[PDB]
Ligand binder design. Structure first.
Ligand code: FAD
Ligand code: FAD
Ligand code: SF4
Ligand code: SF4
Ligand code: SF4
Ligand code: SF4
Lengths: 642, 149, 642, 149
């Protein structure tokens, strides 16, 4: 709910337009966007190209890493700088198995061969990495290293700023739609946005556009619906903007049915990675049963996924869901037993790991430490409850939802190159349009380091694209004007109909952003495998979801906004609604349950490797208002065996 | 969510910009021009990321746990420096914990983005190599990955 | 969420006190309260007794019947005034079987032998009852008769006003606590309240007090959490006030674990009674299966309850829950097939039944008709989705939670009279304190007619009690002053700590009523068999609930209020929290699952007639802060067989 | 929830009481002394009972379905009389339905609570009979119920 202190209303015709011409436009200044700005600045010099970074908030703390992070979740270690070295083939196998067999290995192997360099730069720039007495990076699990990352984002922001230049960074500018080439329906030409600090409409003209908006949250109703609706596990700041603008432009999405359900500390959603992998914490149900063991049998049916080590995350979730369905909650993270066993009676050792435990929270999810403080929970004395949150859509973490993007020339097979008019690394099916981080699908487990890395890869590819193809798209002024009118339409609608009611938020002719969002969350929660049905859905429910989303999309044309802040909220809602629609259509298309633990199709409860071991790709045609789906069979690109 | 202590807040009137308004990733912190004091304009959209809390030069901002699940009385207070950050965790029962963690090993604003890197070349632009590679990866040669036969 | 336009603050010592002396005080002017006011006025003349009715809102439309009702759910018909005559023995059997064997038959048989007279008076007073051409009351099902009841409450309000006199009715006065006899720790002496229209503290001194506050809603998180949190199926106006003040006074509760889960039209919660019983509508899952058929065998384990006719409502809910857990939603009410079948090709007949169908909604739950309008649902063309709402606690409807009350001397067995110091009909274990309607437990299915009837019963018993025992309660002025300070404490706390934050609703030293309510709803939903777990719970979850309720209860001492409206909201929250605790403790005590469909104890999944065919009664001792539970074995009072 | 139409609302001219404020079972309707126009002060606590709508002499109150599940466009408008009530239901798609139901068979304010009842007596006070019984029940005598043998 939002109650503005006062009005801040503008009509489109009274808002001045500021045109910005650039060669490479990066939308979003988070981890992937900063990686793109950094790398682009290096290669751009070859053609005196201009690089522009636009961020809706402030790069210093914007995005998922606002609080910092307690570990870098992707560090291969090909030389032995950490406690555990790994190989690239082992990593690719690991990601494919976690995805229950479906991952673009050309894209995964690609960011993986580059990621360690990024991490090394991060340390060189000042990021303090946990080290052993021998000077080795401290491992959390097999692929992550612990960091003192409270300032992780500010450090990366500084690197990007020094690289591209402050004059090329536009903050507090919300991008709501892309612009396409007037003379080419499948080529990008720029983007439009508006300031949230003053009345100013932005028209960005670019040869290449890189989507780095982060994923999408608040599509589903959370387990807390009051103030705590703000406590989404994933970044509340990311509302599926990239997904919306890219899909509207005609860029194909892939694996959009692949949501991520995070099992974390209850309510605050503090991390469990360190507790599980580093502190060797055990998770048990209300009756002290360690379900990863008692529910081991249930995973045998999944071959070979059920016998993989580590067990794929969705299957780990599935064991948890079975306990929940049986009503064996609360589920506990036995931190008290973990700390006692690790300390081994050494009080000084206890104090040390105790401090490490609190840093794991204070460096990234302070709310959990605050929750413990408010509830008088001392981790060395009593266990904490854990629970799976509502669904989130993103492609950089354990979820792989995002745009279907091109891979590197040396790794991408012909099988995966078919839909790309131009074969540039990380370019979408729309020429000149790239997608990175959460926006790039089918190549998950990138996390902070991998996202920054993917941004670097797309950036170099964008420079190469511009110098080789010498793109020169032309925006359509008529469309720009129509979009400028749309941009501020919510404010004009408020002014036009507010007099129908003595209450600004109870009007028969418009819905405010928070009102449309509550509605979206309810629809998704009840019909799209949300928490309401313990992540279960079926064809009928999904079809009803589309019907209800249709009503909501029509009502978006009647959105109202009272100030710039709410105008942004209005478009963030628009972005989520279309993201939600794509998610529903993707879940509806795939007739199987490949990721039990993330979602279950009760009408197709089994995993089908006979006809569904394929990526599901879709395209939305705005002119025809039609969605088309196709199956792209998975092919093993990298050498590995189970 | 975050909340501003009227006593400590001076509206950043002695600064070129309003710190909390500037830093908030979700655009929640703003100024009440009347009081010339900040406030969280939409608390249920607060991620409790503590960015505003850490950047308020007057230490006027604190966080009151979401009412949905937070009993009153708890608090986490940071004191962020240049090389480290200090935290005081105060329990509802009065218990107080104190921690101190490093946050940066180099001076702020000291990053030289391409330090040591050779100049980019048109020939290099066509390879799979990113700036500083392959050496920044720790190897003399670019990492190879076995393709499936 | 509440955002007051302006402050309305008062300090206890600035508020004038109004002392009201009466003989019989009726708290709550809904259906049971009006029934008590009506009857009390008749017998009071014997002693020139003063009868006082206090209502927080306005009697004309206050309570569950604010929109009216489409039927009278309890009309035995012992002469043949309706399409179907019934016997009292059959009715008592029906209610006991619906309660899965647990009902105070002395109380049920008692209101049943009186209810028809009340209905006949209602018709006399102007209520239009549906009639057949032959002049017979139109039957809905076996026990209900259809009515044109839009003005059902106003008509009843008039009867009560005419009987007791407007000078004896206090409106817009919220009662928050009872007063006990200073001369006797287990005797009532009156009650205290405050006006919500002006700064005025009320002290009601009485010889007899009758609790008629209605049940309790919004204890659990609803299926809609935005504006629609207001669309509770049961009366949102009833917040467990009677339960709170009565239990605090030491009056024993019974069957408080027995919540009611209403299966109604989804979201709007329109009625299904007429559709099922009158229109013969079928409910089918997403695949077209009529689950009352496919799930019939699953009730075989509940012999002989599963063989009853009609089938016990909780068991009907159980069948629904099984469908929901299997993922067979949406569940549809096939109104289109019902209307077509009933009309039989007769277009004029269709028009007639179509008007009847809409009246069924417009006469009691307009929101459902509005929902259809907004969603373009025409019942003659397409079916509607149905679903079970969150739990509600009341004793007049299908739920039997309420106070343990005394029955008539001619029906109550010695087995049930043991806990009453004085044997007066509907008196609680606290001398002089009576409970009626939703407030009287163990005798459900009273509905509108039965609640009014129960009020009449208690009112006559109250007059008898006064004239026979001749009580002369003395209020404790010291306690009264303590309560006066507590009454406005929230306003004084707001003024005292508001300066700690620039935002009125984000303060570290207090919670606002809506904030505490969101918290209560989350706790009950997640741990007390709410919708979150498909109504499942266990010992551990319930125990954790008590822990979280303990924190909340302590925080109630830090409640704040910005105006009189919110001050009432603060106390309504206080009332709900204690009601919630009692409910949790009752569910924790009964180690069995007797009402699957309403709630499941996953740790004690079976119905236990060997050890739990008893009423669970409890008493809260405010001085010692201790809860004591007792098991009162059920005894069959009325003659009947399965 | 309910909402007031400014153009029709007159803050209840010179009458003795504000209708909407007087009737609301949840104390939601109130006056904005400044505008002299009413409004729903807490819409998420509105049961959509339509009491305020029916009692507004200017017909200045309507109901806009809860946003959680209500697409825009639907409306239910009552015109309550003395012996009947008329309803107009308008669908989002333009469809319009009209109904009319009885609401009372006698004049308002005509109830005689104990009409025809004998006076109460101390002896009667000790029986199970309520006012008007057993006559009002319609049976030949006070209803008897068989006790379990
Ligand atoms: C609670 C949590 C725990 C995690 N734990 C780990 C961990 O321990 N280690 C690890 O390595 N990784 C972890 N990650 C993952 C990591 O943070 C991501 O993988 C990474 O930040 C994704 O980068 P991004 O660029 O895709 O999104 P982000 O970094 O979120 O950036 C997106 C940017 O786009 C902006 N933006 C959005 N919409 C618009 C618009 N319309 N116009 C302009 N700008 C816009 C945002 O404001 C933000 O600046 C975690 C994330 C969360 C939220
Ligand atoms: C959606 C719905 C459908 C139903 N359908 C049917 C049907 O079709 N037919 C039928 O016969 N019955 C039906 N009933 C049942 C019927 O309405 C009840 O059984 C009856 O109203 C219960 O009477 P009550 O006196 O216990 O509660 P109510 O009538 O609700 O009255 C309680 C009173 O107490 C007041 N109050 C509460 N707290 C306080 C306080 N602290 N101080 C002062 N006053 C207070 C309330 O404002 C109200 O005036 C239905 C109820 C609902 C909500
Ligand atoms: S940064 Fe601190 S001092 Fe400055 S406006 Fe915000 S709260 Fe006030
Ligand atoms: S805690 Fe974070 S999201 Fe909340 S106001 Fe402060 S900066 Fe914004
Ligand atoms: S009853 Fe109608 S005219 Fe009177 S104040 Fe309310 S809305 Fe305005
Ligand atoms: S519809 Fe009913 S609950 Fe809502 S404001 Fe009107 S009278 Fe009050």
């Amino acid at each position: 709910v939002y109650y503005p202190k006062k009005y801040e209303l503008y009509k489109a015709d009274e808002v001045p337009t500021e045109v910005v011409e650039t060669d490479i436009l990066i939308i979003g200044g988070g981890f992937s966007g900063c990686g793109a700005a950094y790398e682009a600045a290096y290669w751009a010099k070859l053609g005196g190209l201009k690089v522009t970074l636009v961020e809706k908030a402030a790069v210093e703390r914007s995005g998922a890493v606002a609080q910092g992070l307690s570990a870098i979740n992707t560090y291969i270690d090909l030389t032995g700088r950490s406690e555990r070295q790994n190989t690239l083939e082992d990593y690719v196998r690991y990601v494919t198995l976690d995805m229950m067999g479906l991952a673009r290995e050309d894209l995964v192997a690609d960011y993986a061969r580059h990621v360690d360099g990024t991490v090394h730069l991060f340390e060189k720039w000042g990021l303090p990495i946990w080290k052993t007495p021998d000077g080795k990076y401290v491992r959390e699990g097999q692929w992550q290293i612990m960091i003192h990352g409270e300032s992780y984002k500010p450090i990366i922001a500084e690197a990007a700023k020094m690289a591209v230049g402050e004059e090329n960074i536009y903050e507090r500018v919300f991008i709501f739609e892309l612009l396409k080439d007037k003379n080419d329906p499948n080529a990008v030409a720029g983007a439009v946005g508006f300031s949230v600090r003053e009345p100013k409409f932005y028209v960005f003209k670019a040869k290449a556009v890189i989507l780095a908006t982060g994923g999408a949250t608040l599509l589903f109703r959370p387990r807390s619906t009051g103030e705590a609706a703000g406590r989404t596990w994933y970044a509340i700041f990311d509302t599926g903007s990239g997904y919306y603008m890219g899909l509207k432009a005609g860029a194909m999405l892939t694996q959009f049915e692949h949501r991520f359900i995070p099992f974390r500390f209850k309510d605050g959603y503090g991390p469990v990675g360190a507790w599980f992998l580093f502190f060797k914490c055990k998770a048990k149900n209300a009756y002290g049963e360690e379900y990863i063991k008692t529910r081991a049998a249930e995973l045998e049916k999944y071959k070979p996924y059920g016998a993989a080590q580590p067990i794929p995350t969705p299957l780990r979730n599935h064991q948890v869901m079975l306990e929940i369905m049986d009503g064996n909650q609360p589920i506990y993270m036995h931190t008290e037993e973990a700390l006692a066993e690790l300390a081994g009676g050494d009080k000084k050792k206890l104090k040390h790991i105790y401090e490490e435990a609190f840093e794991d929270f204070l460096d990234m999810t302070v709310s959990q430490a605050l929750l413990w403080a408010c509830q008088n929970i001392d981790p060395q004395e009593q266990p904490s409850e854990a629970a799976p949150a509502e669904p989130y859509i993103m492609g950089s973490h354990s979820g792989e939802a995002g745009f279907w993007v091109c891979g590197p020339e040396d790794l991408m097979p012909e099988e995966y190159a078919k839909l790309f008019p131009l074969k540039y690394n990380r370019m979408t099916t729309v020429k000149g349009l790239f997608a990175i981080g959460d926006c790039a699908g089918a190549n998950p487990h990138k996390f902070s380091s991998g996202s920054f890395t993917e941004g670097r890869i797309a950036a170099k590819a964008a420079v190469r694209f511009i110098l080789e193809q010498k793109p020169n798209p032309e925006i359509d002024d008529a469309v720009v004007e129509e979009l400028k009118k749309k941009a501020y339409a919510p404010m004009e609608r408020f002014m036009q109909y507010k007099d129908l009611s003595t209450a600004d938020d109870v009007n028969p002719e418009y819905i405010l952003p928070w009102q449309g969002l509550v509605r979206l969350q309810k629809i998704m929660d009840e019909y799209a495998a949300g928490i309401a049905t313990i992540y279960k859905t079926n064809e009928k429910m999904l079809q009803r979801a589309l019907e209800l989303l249709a009503f909501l999309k029509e009502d978006l044309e009647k959105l109202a906004a009272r100030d710039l802040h709410e105008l942004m909220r209005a478009w963030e809602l628009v972005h989520r609604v279309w993201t939600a629609e794509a998610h529903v259509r993707h879940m509806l298309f795939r007739k199987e349950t490949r990721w039990p633990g993330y979602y279950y199709r009760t009408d197709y409860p089994e995993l089908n490797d006979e006809e569904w071991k394929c990526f599901v790709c879709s395209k939305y045609d705005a002119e025809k208002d039609e969605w088309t789906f196709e199956k792209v069979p998975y092919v093993q690109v990298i050498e590995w065996s189970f | 969510p975050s909340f501003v202590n009227p006593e400590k807040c001076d509206g950043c009137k002695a600064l070129e910009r309003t710190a909390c308004e500037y830093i908030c990733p979700n655009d929640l912190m703003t100024l009440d021009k009347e009081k010339m004091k900040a406030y969280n304009r939409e608390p249920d959209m607060c991620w409790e990321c503590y960015s505003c809390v850490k950047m308020c030069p007057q230490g006027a901002i604190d966080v009151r746990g979401y009412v949905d699940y937070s009993p009153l009385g708890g608090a986490c207070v940071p004191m962020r420096g240049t090389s480290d950050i200090m935290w005081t965790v105060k329990y509802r029962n009065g218990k107080v914990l104190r921690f101190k963690f490093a946050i940066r090993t180099t001076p702020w604003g000291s990053i030289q983005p391409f330090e040591g890197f050779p100049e980019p070349t048109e020939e290099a632009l066509k390879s799979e190599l990113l700036a500083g590679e392959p050496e920044i990866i720790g190897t003399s040669e670019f990492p190879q990955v076995k393709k499936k036969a």
